[PDB]
Ligand binder design. Structure first.
Ligand SMILES: Cc1cnc(CSc2nc3cc4c(cc3[nH]2)CCO4)c(C)c1Cl
Ligand SMILES: [Mg+2]
Ligand SMILES: [Zn+2]
Length: 313
């Protein structure tokens, strides 16, 4: 009960910042997460024994893929932690509990392949789940782990609170399907501009949480340039393997996944910043003003990608 997690001084300070990098020491990532749960939620939100066993089971169910790995899970949870800490009073007790767990679990058992690749391969998961294939799998895996003996971190919620938090986690994880982001952000853009946005409207909160999940999921573009650039290597290491597997099915992959078009990556990054990232953090900054540092970091990184194209790096 009186057992806090404490971090070294540099981590204690930098972990509060949006652009924090969790570092290369894997063995510290569980403690970093628990630290964030304690400060975000309370030392009482979860039984420490149950939380630690849940964390280690989640870690085991992430695979050794270049990008959609355990480090990504913790990185996405930290971005959510920074959003929640900078918006203290906007979120319920259940929402703070649910969203950190949703983020940690959002890519459970990822194989390093898009929904598109599963559908073209005719993977069994594509028959079980026709849309948001991997994201329905990720939520399915989250429920499985919660149902292991000694792993139900929500046991002390009432029946209705338990149903609410699982519903928050499900929507949150489904919302990480980037195919759904475009429509979600358009709707939020209209609602904010016509002034109809209402955070007491549950359907509106869902949309806002969805955008928070996209923002946390893409947060690689909101780090300092050296982190952003080195993470892009891991992202493309996965995409180019998928591209290779497309060519094995006799399908030319999209240029994003074709390692033969490495040269066009800087231009490809521009389109991504302009079509996805900047719009995402702009709408998020409009709804939640204290998340502006994410939009500022993203704009800085767009500027660095423009400099790569102009041969200045
Ligand atoms: C965080 C993040 C950062 N970067 C990306 C890559 S976005 C992207 N990279 C590309 C490279 C390309 C083309 C299109 C691209 N779109 C055509 C020629 O080569 C993603 C998908 C994410 Cl999720
Ligand atoms: Mg995902
Ligand atoms: Zn993800």
């Amino acid at each position: 009960g009186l057992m806090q997690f404490t971090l070294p001084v540099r981590l204690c300070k930098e972990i509060e910042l949006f652009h924090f990098d969790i570092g290369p020491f894997e063995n510290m990532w569980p403690g970093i997460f628990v630290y964030m749960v304690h400060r975000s939620c309370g030392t009482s939100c979860f039984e420490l024994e149950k939380l630690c066993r849940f964390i280690m089971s989640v870690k085991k169910n992430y695979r050794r893929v270049p990008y959609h790995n355990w480090k990504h899970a913790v990185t996405v949870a930290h971005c959510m932690y920074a959003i929640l800490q900078n918006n203290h009073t906007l979120f319920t007790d259940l929402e703070r509990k649910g969203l950190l767990i949703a983020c940690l679990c959002h890519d459970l058992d990822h194989r390093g392949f898009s929904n598109s690749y599963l559908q073209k391969f005719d993977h069994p998961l594509a028959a079980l789940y026709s849309t948001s294939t991997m994201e329905q799998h990720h939520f399915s895996q989250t429920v499985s782990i919660l149902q292991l003996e000694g792993h139900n971190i929500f046991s002390t919620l009432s029946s209705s609170e338990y149903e609410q938090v699982l519903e928050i986690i499900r929507k949150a994880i489904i919302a990480t399907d980037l195919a759904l982001y475009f429509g979600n952000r358009k709707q939020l853009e209209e609602m904010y501009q016509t002034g109809s946005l209402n955070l007491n409207n549950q359907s509106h909160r869902d949309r806002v949480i969805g955008l928070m999940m996209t923002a946390c999921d893409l947060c690689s573009v909101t780090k300092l340039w050296p982190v952003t650039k080195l993470t892009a290597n891991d992202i493309y290491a996965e995409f180019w393997a998928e591209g290779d597997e497309m060519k094995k099915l006799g399908i030319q992959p999209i240029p994003m996944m074709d390692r033969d078009k490495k040269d066009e990556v800087p231009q490809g990054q521009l389109g991504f910043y302009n079509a996805v990232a900047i719009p995402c953090y702009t709408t998020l900054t409009q709804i939640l003003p204290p998340t502006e540092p994410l939009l500022k970091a993203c704009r800085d990184n767009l500027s660095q990608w423009e400099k790569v194209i102009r041969g200045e790096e």
